[PDB]
C-alpha cells in the first residue's frame, strides 16, 4: 500500500492503476517504463568506468545492500544500478548492448508484466537485465522456453553475461538424472522448457524422500514465447502415467476366501443398514488361511478392505439385480428399470471385488498418478512475466488466468514492412502454382523468401515443385532443431530459400546478410570451443572473430537490402490470426525493409472444414477459372470467420481443461502438503493420535447413533474397534461416557505401543513408524483415487440432462469420494500404526 | 358471408371456424365429418335398391341438378346424394364398400383440407367419392400421386369406379406425346405425378399455337401422398431448359459496324444522358452495310437495337474503367476500388455488345425457358387437398404456403400396433449383428419383417448378411415400381423378409396373408385382360377371382396374425421422424397386430454428419461393450437433433426457393396473360396503337423536357421517330406542348395507311395477324432474353451477402428494373416491326 512520489519505479499501489489502465490504451506505464530507462541510461558512465574485476564485485555489492537491516533497500531499490552493471556486461560480454527499448522491456518484466516485444527487438538478452537483478535474491530465476535446444542454447548464450557477474546459470533438458536436474536447480537463474518444469514438480510431489526434490520453489519465471506456451500450449495437460501398482491378487484371493464363510459363523450382515461385520472366528479363519498373526500386519496391504469389501460383494451386491456382467465388465444396471447405467462403476475398491466375485478376467492397466495443467503449474510463482512479438490479443485471457498485464513495448526503429492483403484462389492446385511462380522470381532477382506451410505433407509437396523448378532450397519440419537453426541462421542471404512446417526455426532471428551472433559461435563451436567448457578461450575468440564474422556477412546485407529485405510467403492461415502475425513478423526486423503475404485457397485445410467447397461450386458456376485470385467481400469475411471459429475453439477447450482442473488442484494441494511434511520429518505424534482420536469418535458416533437405552450394540462397536487396536477394557467393564472411556483407553494403548517399538529400535522409532505408515497410506489410497477420478470425468458427460451444468455434478461428487478418501486414510492409518510389522 | 343451421355441410364463413379451430386440435371439424358421413349412411337404402343402370344415371341426374337454374343446387347440396352413390357403386364394382371413417375422410377432401389418414385406412378408394362428386361440374379433377407406376394403376383401379359411374378417367405419362395428354386433361378426372402436371403447364405457356395447349386450367387438385409432394419435393423446382439462339451474330456484326462509323457525322454521343443516336447519314451506311432498306424490315431482328447498343459500347464504357476483359469474359470493376465485382453483367444486350466490341468468343449456352417451383404451381387450383398418413407435423407449412389444413381422421379399427424404443448401438458392426439375428429368430418363427435402409449400398450389405445365413428374403431398391409392387404385395404372407431402401413400394399395402386386392388383379391381367381395354370381362371375372383369392389367403392370414402381425425393422433414421413414421405405420393395418422399431448406431450415416464419432470415442474409454444398447438421455438427444437439424434444414432450402420463385412468379404471370390474348385470336388493334401512343409519347418526353424554346433537338427526335415508322409531317411544319398532339396524329394516318397496307397484300383484316404475330414473336424473343439475364442474376446474387443487406431484397430490386426494362423495349420493337416488317 505504497506511495509514488519521487520513486522511479512504480511501487505497488501506483503499479496497479499502470498495470490495468493498461487494457485501456492510454500508455502512461509506457511513459513511466521510458522514464526508468532513461534514468538507467544516466548511469551509464558510472558503469563503463570500471574494470572487469569491478562489474562482478557489483553482484556482492547488491547482494549485501539486499540483506543489510540498517539501511534497507529492496530489488526496486536496485533496478537502476542493476540493470546499469548488467546492460554494460552485456555489452562487454557479448559486444551487444541492450537499447533504450530493451531496458523498458527489462523493467516491464521485473514488474511482473508480458513485455510485447516485436521480433528482432532482443528478446533473449532483455531478459538478461531482469533475470540478474531478481537472481540476487538467492531464491532461482527460472525461464521458459519453447524447446530443449533454445533451453540450453540461450543458457549457455546469455549465461555468459551472468556468469561474468558472478552468477551460476543452469538448464534442465529432457535426458538429465534427477541429481543433475538438482545442481541446474540450485543454480541462480535456470532455463528450461514448461515441460521439464512441470514434470520435475510432478515428480518432486511422488518423490519418497526429501533428498529426492529437484526444485527448490517458485519464485520467479519468465515464460519466454508466453503466447506460446501459457496460451496455446495450455490445451493439453501435464499426465505422468503408470499402472495400477498391484493389489488384484487380493481381490482374487478374498474373491476366494468370502465364500468358503458361512454366514452368522464367521460374519454377520446388517441388511438395511448395508454393512458387513466380520466376528472372531473369520478374523482367525482368514488369518490362518494367510498364515499370519493380525490383518493389519503387512505394510501396504489394507487386508481388512479386502475382506470387508469381498463380503459386501458377496452378500449386499446382487447379479441381474445391481449390476450384470457382458465382456468382463461389471456394468451397474438401475433399480427396476433394468437398463445399464452406463459410465458408472462402484466405489472404494468395490467395483474390483465385485470383478473378482464374477471370476472376471483381470487385464492391465494405466492411470493418472500425477497431473497439473500449464495454468496451474505456472500460477505457483510468486512473480510471473514474459516475452513475444504478440500477446495484445490474449490480453484478456493472460489477466484472467495469470493476472498478467501486457505491455507493448515500443521498437528500436520504425517497422516499415510492407504487409500485403491476402491472395485467395479457387483451388489448392491454383494457389500453389501461382506461390512457385513467385518464389522462382524472388529467386531470379536475388531476394531471399521464407514461405511458411501448415503440415509435413505440404512442405514436401511444395519443395518436389521447388525442384521440378531447380530452385535450390531447404525444408525444416520441427523436428531437428538446432541443424535448422543453422539453416534459419543463413535464411537472409541472397539466393534463400526456406520453407518452414508450422514455425519451424522458432527463435533464431532470420537476419539478412546473415546471424552474426549464430554464426560466430558456429565459427568456434565447430574449432571445440565452448562457453562453458573452454570459457576464456570462448571469450577471446568471441571478441576477435566476431568483427571478421560481421564483415563478410554485412557486406552481403547491404545486397540483401536492395533486392527488398525478407519475402515471407504464407501459404495457408494458422489457427489464429496471432501466429500468421508471427510469421509476417519474421520480416522486418530493426527496421529493416521487407515484404509479407499470404496465398489462401477455398480447398485449404481451414476452409474445407467449413464452406470453401460450397464457395468453389459457386465461382466455378460464375464462370470465374483457376489461376485468378479472387477478389469478393464475402470470401474474405468468410476466411476471418473460419480462423476466428477456430481461435474461439480452441479458447473453449482451453477454458474447459482448467476449470475442470481446478477440482483436482485443490485436493492435490492438500495432499501433497500431507506428502511435504511427511518427507521434512516433522514430528507427527499429535496428528496421529488425533486420528486415532477422529477415528474411535467417528465409530461411536456410528454404532450409537442417538437411541437411549439398551438399544446400542456394543458387540458390533467392539469387533469393529478390535480390527484396529488392542481395546484394553469391556463394554461389561462401565455397565457421552462411552467415548470419553474408549478414548482413554485408546491412548494408553498407544503409549503401549510406542514403547513396544521403542524396545524393537527405540528413541524415536513411533516417530518413524508414524511417518512410515502414513505416507504409504496415503500413496496407496491416493493413487485408486486417481484411478477411479479418471473413470469420473470420462463419463461426467454422459450423465448430464436437460439443464444442470455436469461440472457442478463433477464438482459434488468429486469431493466425496476425496473426503471419504480421506477418512478411509485415516483408518487404516490407525490399524497400521497399531498392528504393522517391525 | 354463409349461414349454417340446417345445412349438414359446412359452407362459407362457418368452415372457416372450423378450419381455424383445427390448427388448435379441438376436434370440432372431425364432429361435423362425423356428422355429415353418419347422414350419408342413412341413403344408402335409396342406392341399394336401384339398377346398375339406375345407378349409372344418377351422374346425368346431378349434372343436370346443377345446370338447373330454376332450382339451384351446389357441389354441396349434391355431397350427400353424390357421395352415396359413389359409395355404393364402389361395393358393387370392387365389392368394397367405403368404410364411415372414409365418407368422413372423403368431406375433408371435398372441403380443401388435407385428410391425414393412416396407413392402410384406403386413401386412394376414399378419394374415389370427392373426386366424383367435384367432377360433376366437368371443369375436370387432378389426381396426383408420387410416380407414373402409381398414376397408371389408380386410374385403371379406381377408373372402374368412375367408369361404371359414367365418367372418364384419363392418366397422364412422362411418355405421352401432346395429342395423348390433351385427351387425358379432357377426361372428367385426371391422374398424374407433379411432374407431368407441372412440365405440361410449363410447355402451355411456351405453346405457339391454341391447338398446342394440353391443360384445361387448374379447378381442382387432390394431391396423394402430400408431404412427399408438397412438402419433401418441393425443395426442387420444375425447369425446361434449351440453348439460348441468341442474337450472337448480329452483335458481332455490329461489333465490325460500330468503329467503321464516325462520331457526330453518323452517329452523336450524349454525355450526360448516357444516350447515343444514329444520324439520317448513319441509318444509311447501316442500312446499305447489311442491304436493307429499313432496320425494323427483318423480322426478329430488333437491328435499332442491336446498333445502339454497338454504339453505347464504343462510346460509353471504357475498357479498364468501367469493365476489364479476364479469360473470355467482360468483368465488371467499381469506379474506385478497382475490384471485379464479379457476378454482375450489364443490362439488356449491353454485356452482349461489350463482349463482341473486346472481340470476345461467344460461347453457345444452355438457359432457362420455363420454371415454376411445385408451391407456385398447385397455388394455381381453385381447390386444392391432400391425403397422407402424416401430414399433422407439417401443419404450419402446409397453412402458410397452400391455405391446406390438416384434419385427423380417427382409424377404422383402434390400431394396436407397438411401436418399440430405438435400439442404440456404439457401432455400425454391431448394430447390423443385432439386426440380423433378430430378422433370423423372427424368420424362424413365422414373421413377415420389412426392413428399411437409407441407402442401396446398405441394402445391398444386409441381403448377403441374410443370405450367408439362410433366410430367403427380398431387395427393393425403389428402381422398378411395378415389379416391386409385386414383392410388397406378398412381404405379408408366412416367411416374408423384405428389404425396402428408402421407401420402397411406397402404395401399395403390405396386407397379412397376403395383398388379395393386388394378386386377383394380377390373376386377371396375366389373362390378357385389362380395366379399360376389357372393361365388361375384367368386371365379371373380377366378381368370380376375388372370394378364391380370398380364400386362399384367409387361412395364412390367420397365421400371420398368430405370429404377431408385420414386424417392421428400421436400420437408420431418416432426414425427418415423419418420415421414420410412415415406415413404422406399414405394420399395423385396420387393427392388425404388429410391432416396429428401429437400430441405430453411432456410425450412421446422420450421426457422422454431426458428433456420432465424438461419442463413440467416449463411449469406448468408458469400458461399454459394442453389443450393449445405450440408454442415456445424453445420446438421446444427440440422435434427436441430429435429424432435427436437418429437417430444419431441408425447411430452410424450401424456404429459400419460394422466396426466389415469387420474383419470377409474378413476372410470368404477367408475361403467360400476354401470350394468352394472342394465341386466342384476340383483337390487339387497340392495344396496338396504345403502344404506338405509348413509344411516341416518351421520345417526345425525352427530347422536349426542360428548354421550352428552340432549345430542343427537333433534329434528333425526328430522325429517331422514324427508325419507327414514316413520319408523315417532319418539324418545319409546326413552328407549345403539342407536337405530341401533332406527331400522335400522323402516326395514327400511318397506321391505317400501313393497315391498308396489309389488306392490300393479304386482305380481310389481315394486319390483325400482323399485331399478333409480331407481338408474339417480340415477346418470347424477349423473355427468353430476360430469363437468360434472370440466369445469371440468381447466382451471383449470394456473392452480395454482406452484413446486413438482405440479398433477396437485391435481387428484387434488379430483377424487377430487367423486367420493366424488358416491358418498355417489348413496346418499342413491337411498334418498328409493325410499321416495317417485310411481309
Same mark, same amino acid.
Given at each position: 500500500d505504497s506511495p509514488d512520489l519521487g520513486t522511479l519505479v512504480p511501487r505497488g499501489s501506483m503499479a496497479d492503476i499502470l498495470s490495468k489502465l493498461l487494457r485501456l490504451g492510454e500508455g502512461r506505464m509506457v511513459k513511466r517504463l521510458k522514464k526508468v530507462a532513461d534514468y538507467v541510461g544516466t548511469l551509464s558512465d558510472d558503469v563503463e568506468k570500471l574494470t572487469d574485476a569491478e562489474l562482478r564485485a557489483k553482484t556482492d555489492e547488491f547482494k549485501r545492500r539486499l540483506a543489510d537491516q540498517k539501511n534497507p533497500e529492496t530489488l526496486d531499490d536496485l533496478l537502476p544500478e542493476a540493470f546499469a552493471v548488467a546492460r554494460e556486461a552485456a555489452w562487454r560480454v557479448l559486444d551487444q548492448r541492450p537499447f533504450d527499448v530493451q531496458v523498458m522491456g527489462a523493467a516491464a518484466l521485473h514488474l511482473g508484466n508480458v513485455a510485447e516485444m516485436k521480433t528482432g527487438e532482443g528478446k533473449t538478452l532483455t531478459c538478461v537485465l531482469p533475470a540478474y537483478l531478481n537472481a540476487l535474491a538467492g531464491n532461482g530465476v527460472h525461464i521458459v522456453t519453447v524447446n530443449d535446444y533454445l533451453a540450453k542454447r540461450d543458457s549457455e548464450w546469455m549465461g555468459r553475461v551472468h556468469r561474468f557477474l558472478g552468477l551460476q546459470v543452469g538448464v534442465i533438458l529432457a535426458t538429465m538424472t534427477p541429481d543433475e536436474r538438482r545442481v541446474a536447480y540450485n543454480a541462480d537463474i535456470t532455463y528450461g522448457t514448461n515441460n521439464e518444469f512441470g514434470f520435475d514438480y510432478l515428480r518432486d510431489n511422488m518423490?519418497? $524422500?526429501? *533428498?529426492?526434490?529437484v526444485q527448490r520453489g517458485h519464485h520467479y519465471a519468465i515464460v519466454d514465447e508466453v503466447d506460446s506456451i501459457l /496460451? *496455446?500450449?495450455?490445451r493439453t495437460p501435464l499426465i505422468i502415467s503408470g499402472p495400477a501398482d498391484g493389489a488384484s491378487n487380493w481381490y482374487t484371493e478374498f474373491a476366494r476366501l468370502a465364500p468358503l464363510m458361512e454366514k452368522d459363523v464367521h460374519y454377520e450382515v446388517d441388511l438395511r443398514k448395508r454393512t458387513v461385520g466380520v466376528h472372531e472366528k473369520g478374523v482367525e479363519f482368514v488369518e490362518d488361511q494367510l498364515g499370519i *498373526? !493380525?490383518?493389519?500386519?503387512? @505394510? !501396504? $496391504?489394507?487386508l481388512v478392505s479386502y475382506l470387508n469389501n469381498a463380503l459386501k460383494a458377496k452378500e449386499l451386491f446382487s447379479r441381474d439385480k445391481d449390476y450384470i456382467v457382458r465382456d468382463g465388465e461389471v456394468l451397474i444396471v438401475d433399480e427396476?428399470? %433394468?437398463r445399464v447405467l452406463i459410465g458408472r462403476r462402484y466405489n472404494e475398491g468395490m467395483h474390483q471385488a465385485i470383478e473378482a466375485k464374477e471370476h472376471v478376467e483381470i487385464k492391465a492397466e494405466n492411470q493418472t498418478l500425477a497431473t497439473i495443467t500449464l495454468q496451474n503449474y505456472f500460477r505457483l510463482y510468486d512473480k510471473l512475466a514474459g516475452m513475444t512479438g504478440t500477446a495484445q490479443t490474449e490480453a484478456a485471457e493472460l489477466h484472467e488466468i495469470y493476472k498478467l498485464g501486457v505491455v507493448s513495448i515500443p521498437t528500436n526503429m520504425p517497422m516499415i514492412r510492407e504487409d500485403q492483403s491476402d491472395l485467395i484462389y479457387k483451388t489448392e492446385e491454383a494457389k500453389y502454382i501461382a506461390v512457385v511462380d513467385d518464389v522462382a522470381e524472388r529467386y531470379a532477382k536475388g531476394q531471399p523468401v521464407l514461405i511458411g506451410t501448415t503440415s509435413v505433407e505440404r512442405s514436401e509437396y511444395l519443395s518436389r515443385q521447388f525442384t521440378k523448378r531447380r530452385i535450390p532450397h531447404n525444408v525444416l519440419n520441427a523436428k531437428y532443431h538446432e541443424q535448422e537453426a543453422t539453416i534459419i541462421a543463413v535464411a537472409? =542471404?541472397?539466393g534463400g530459400v526456406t520453407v518452414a512446417t508450422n514455425?519451424? %526455426? #522458432? &527463435?533464431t532471428d532470420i537476419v539478412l546478410g546473415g546471424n552474426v551472433d549464430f554464426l560466430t559461435d558456429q565459427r568456434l563451436r565447430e574449432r571445440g570451443?565452448?562457453?562453458? +567448457?573452454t570459457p576464456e578461450e570462448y571469450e577471446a575468440a568471441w571478441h576477435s572473430e566476431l568483427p571478421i564474422v560481421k564483415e563478410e556477412a554485412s557486406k552481403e546485407a547491404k545486397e540483401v537490402i536492395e533486392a527488398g529485405g525478407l519475402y515471407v510467403l504464407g501459404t495457408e492461415r494458422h489457427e489464429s490470426r496471432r501466429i500468421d502475425n508471427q510469421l509476417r513478423g519474421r $520480416? %522486418? =526486423?530493426?527496421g529493416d525493409p521487407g515484404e509479407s503475404r499470404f496465398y489462401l485457397s477455398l480447398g485449404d485445410e481451414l476452409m474445407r472444414r467449413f464452406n470453401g467447397a460450397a464457395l468453389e461450386t459457386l465461382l466455378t458456376r460464375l464462370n470465374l477459372p483457376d489461376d485468378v485470385p479472387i477478389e469478393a467481400k464475402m470470401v474474405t469475411r468468410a476466411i476471418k470467420s473460419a480462423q476466428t471459429q477456430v481461435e474461439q475453439q480452441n479458447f473453449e477447450v482451453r477454458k474447459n481443461v482448467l476449470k475442470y482442473d481446478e477440482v483436482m488442484n485443490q485436493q492435490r494441494k492438500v495432499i501433497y502438503a500431507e506428502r511435504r511434511r511427511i518427507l521434512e520429518g516433522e514430528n507427527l505424534k499429535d496428528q496421529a493420535l488425533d486420528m486415532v482420536r477422529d477415528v474411535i469418535t467417528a465409530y461411536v458416533d456410528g454404532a450409537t447413533g +442417538? &437411541?437411549? @437405552?439398551?438399544?446400542?450394540d456394543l458387540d458390533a462397536l467392539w469387533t469393529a474397534l478390535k480390527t484396529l487396536y488392542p481395546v484394553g /477394557?469391556? @463394554? *461389561?467393564s462401565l455397565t457421552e461416557e462411552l467415548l470419553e472411556a474408549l478414548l482413554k483407553d485408546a491412548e494408553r494403548a498407544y503409549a503401549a505401543r510406542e514403547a513396544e517399538l521403542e524396545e524393537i529400535a527405540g528413541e524415536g522409532a513411533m516417530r518413524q513408524l508414524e511417518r512410515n505408515v502414513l505416507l504409504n497410506v496415503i500413496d496407496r489410497k491416493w493413487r485408486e483415487h486417481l484411478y477411479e477420478m479418471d473413470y469420473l470425468k470420462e463419463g461426467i &458427460?454422459? =450423465? @448430464?440432462?436437460?439443464? #444442470?451444468?455436469?461440472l457442478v455434478e463433477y464438482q459434488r461428487e468429486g469431493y466425496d469420494m476425496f473426503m471419504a478418501m480421506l477418512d478411509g486414510m485415516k483408518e487404516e492409518s490407525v490399524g497400521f500404526l497399531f498392528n504393522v510389522t517391525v
Open positions: 518423490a519418497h $524422500s526429501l *533428498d529426492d526434490l /496460451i *496455446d500450449e495450455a *498373526d !493380525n490383518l493389519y500386519e503387512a @505394510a !501396504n $496391504s489394507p427396476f428399470t %433394468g537472409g =542471404r541472397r514455425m519451424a %526455426g #522458432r &527463435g570451443l565452448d562457453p562453458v +567448457e $520480416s %522486418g =526486423r530493426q +442417538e &437411541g437411549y @437405552a439398551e438399544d446400542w /477394557i469391556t @463394554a *461389561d &458427460g454422459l =450423465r @448430464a440432462m436437460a439443464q #444442470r451444468d455436469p
